[PDB]
Design a protein around this ligand. Structure first.
Ligand SMILES: N[C@@H](CCCC[NH3+])C(=O)O
Ligand SMILES: [Cl-]
Ligand SMILES: [K+]
Lengths: 111, 8, 110
C-alpha cells in the first residue's frame, strides 16, 4: 500500500557522487529541478545532498497537487541504468531535516 | 532480510 | 559539516517498536549488516530510552563512518525515513567511554 502524496518528497538515483565529474554538477541539478518544477506546480524548497550515495534530492512544493505533478514529471526517467524514484516524506520528517523549509511559502521562480 | 528500504 | 568516526541514526524505531521481544537486537543486527557492506562498525548503542529512535554508532575510521553515513542518511528503515548526523569524537567518547577501547569489528547476533 503506497504512501499518500504530501508536499514533500525525496528523489533517488539523481546522481552518483563517486562518479560525478562535472564541476558544479550539484547546483546544475538543483537549478534544473527548479526549472522542471516551474513547468508544473513550482517549488518552495529544494536540497541536493551532494554526499548521498543513493543520489537524493529533497523537494518541497507549495501544495500536494504541485508535488504530485513534480514527482510525475521527474520520476521514471533513467540515469545510468537506474530509475529516478520518488518517495513522499511526511511533513514533520521533512521539517526536522530542513528547518528553514517550514516557513517557506513563496515560490522559487527566478526573476 | 533486513528492514532497510522497507516502505511504510 | 564535520565528518568523524561516530554518528547518530534517528527515526529508527518508536516506543511501539519496543513491544516485541528482541526488537533492539534486530535493529543492531540490521545496522551491523549494513556497515559491513562499507567499513564495518566497532561500537553500537540502541537507545531504548529515546522516543526519537536513536542509534549511536562508532566505526573504525572516519572513512568507514562516511561510507556508512552516506549510505544510510535518507534511507528508509521500517517504514520511516532515517537521518544520520555525525557526532564529534570527544562527544562520543564522553557519552560512551567504553567505545574508546572497542576495536573488534562487530558481527550480527546468532
Ligand atoms: N498537471 C501537471 C502536468 C502533468 C499531467 C500530464 N502527465 C502540471 O502541473 O502541468
Ligand atoms: Cl518518516
Ligand atoms: K516521468
Amino acid at each position: 500500500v503506497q504512501p499518500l502524496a504530501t508536499q514533500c518528497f525525496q528523489l533517488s538515483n539523481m546522481f552518483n557522487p563517486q562518479t560525478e565529474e562535472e564541476v558544479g554538477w550539484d547546483t546544475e541539478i538543483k537549478d534544473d529541478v527548479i526549472e522542471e518544477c516551474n513547468k508544473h506546480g513550482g517549488v518552495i524548497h529544494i536540497y541536493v545532498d551532494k554526499n548521498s550515495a543513493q543520489g537524493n534530492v529533497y523537494v518541497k512544493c507549495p501544495s500536494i497537487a504541485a508535488a504530485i505533478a513534480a514527482v510525475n514529471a521527474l520520476h521514471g526517467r533513467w540515469f545510468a541504468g537506474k530509475m529516478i524514484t520518488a518517495a513522499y516524506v511526511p511533513l514533520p520528517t521533512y521539517h526536522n531535516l530542513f528547518p528553514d523549509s517550514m516557513t517557506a511559502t513563496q515560490l522559487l521562480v527566478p526573476s | 532480510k533486513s528492514r532497510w528500504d522497507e516502505t511504510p
